[PDB]
Amino acid sequence: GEITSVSTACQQLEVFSRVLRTSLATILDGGEENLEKNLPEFAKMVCHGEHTYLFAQAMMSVLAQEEQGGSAVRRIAQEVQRFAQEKGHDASQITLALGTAASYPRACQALGAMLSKGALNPADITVLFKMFTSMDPPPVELIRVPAFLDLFMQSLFKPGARINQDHKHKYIHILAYAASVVETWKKNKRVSINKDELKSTSKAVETVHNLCCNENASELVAELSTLYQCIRFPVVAMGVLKWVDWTVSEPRYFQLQPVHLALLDEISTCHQLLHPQVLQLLVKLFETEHSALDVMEQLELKKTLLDRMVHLLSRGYVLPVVSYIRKCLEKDTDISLIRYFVTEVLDVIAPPYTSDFVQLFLPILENDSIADPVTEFIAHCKSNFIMVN
């Protein structure tokens, strides 16, 4: 409810510490669903200065050491590291000093360079490649940095792109290595390295990479069966999701008769960890002002985007999806589109329902209740559910 300037909140360490404590509490409460809202209010404070960034990241690293739920703080720290990156702040020096990355001179050097520049160069890629091919490769956790892996996404699956054919296998291998290789440790000593899945994963990435850069895609439908099989690899599904994003999000795309969106249903079915990104994309395309499209074309397109949400919902990502439809209803979107979402959802769901679902789906039902599965759902809820306190 109260507002505060960034400068004031950072001037006193005492004051900054208190806001950090409540902000972090809120983000941990909001879960991954409300992450996109609760994050920037914290990140803006933390990224005010390099010293403020240092202190907050030191606090988050210590919390991340907790066996029970410490991973959730590591997520928050990575979200903030991305905020700094997108605002032109270089936080690679801090990120590497923050962990055990500095324990390996050569690799940490090459990794920090690329993280500072924000792109992948063949020089530092070869240095990493040779080391992971040797009899004694560095810990795989070193190349499993979100900021690093993303650089591969925009270099391998982005419409384009500038890349060297004599180095392409090195880019693919390092990515596939980060995605599939499994190490075993005992008392901080690495016992074995499992590379069984490295061959098939590397092939999956290489296959889809060749398809994406090609485009024209009209050849996509022909190799769809191969494409679906590769999507089962999470690293590949991320790539396809990003590729579909860059393809569709770019203006002057909707002049065709859409296979790009159809792939999203396969992504959702295979990978629950990608559901909040799939939805994030679907709501980005749902709120775009298509000035080049015809009115009837805008309506059907939005219906198409809703069909993706209903599919996503049917994969077990229901509460955040239902929540979004209620938000644009109470606050814009025409009534016909909201009624279509209700119709389609009520056509595939059945009791028992949880109270958490009813608490969100019943209110959206009784705002403009004129449309029988609707009244039957209301009758069920009235019979089987109770308000407390």
Binding site: L13, A58, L224
Partner: protein, 177 residues
């Protein structure tokens, strides 16, 4: 150098910039580092915070050379009046020798003790289906399970009587070939 403290003000005194300025590695001459112990007392907090954070941007070679001088400065900062300078000096005290930051920060530090105290309890309260780091989104199941354990299945909020309209769409696009 004459008035080396005045020169640091004209280089890092910019209130607008709160992060390391471009080409900060060239501003921190080895000779300058040895001159900081002479003029540190009069420096503002802003400049000190740019100075201390600047040590992270120096190559491992340059750091190891004047690690003795760096330890002397970081010690000076640990006796400063500004709470921000003190906090930063406690995080960097492990750096010039190990190249890694210090994460043991609770010793006689009420702020840190209050932060970690309250949040360690909060972190443990949300261990049920806690959000995972971003790298997990890129991993095959076996690497994922090794690193973060089995994923909690989605809560079943209802029961599917029939498959949605998207199920028919998959079969169609598979028939076209």
């Amino acid at each position: 150098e004459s008035d080396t403290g005045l020169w640091l003000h004209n280089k890092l005194g910019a209130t607008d910039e709160l992060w390391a300025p471009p080409s900060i590695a060239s501003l921190l001459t080895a000779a300058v580092i040895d001159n900081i112990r002479l003029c540190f007392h009069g420096l503002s907090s802003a400049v000190k915070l740019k100075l201390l954070l600047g040590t992270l941007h120096l190559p491992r070679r340059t750091v190891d050379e004047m690690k003795g001088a760096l330890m002397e400065i970081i010690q000076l900062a640990s006796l400063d009046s500004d709470p921000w300078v003190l906090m930063v000096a406690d995080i960097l005290k492990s750096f010039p020798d190990t190249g890694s930051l210090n994460l043991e920060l609770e010793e006689q530090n009420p702020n840190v003790q209050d932060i970690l105290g309250e949040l360690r309890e909060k972190v443990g309260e949300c261990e049920a289906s806690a959000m995972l780091p971003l790298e997990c989104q890129y991993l095959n199941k076996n690497a994922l399970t090794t690193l973060a354990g089995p994923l909690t299945p989605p809560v079943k909020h209802f029961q599917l009587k029939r498959k949605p309209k998207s199920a028919t769409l998959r079969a169609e696009l598979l028939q076209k070939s």
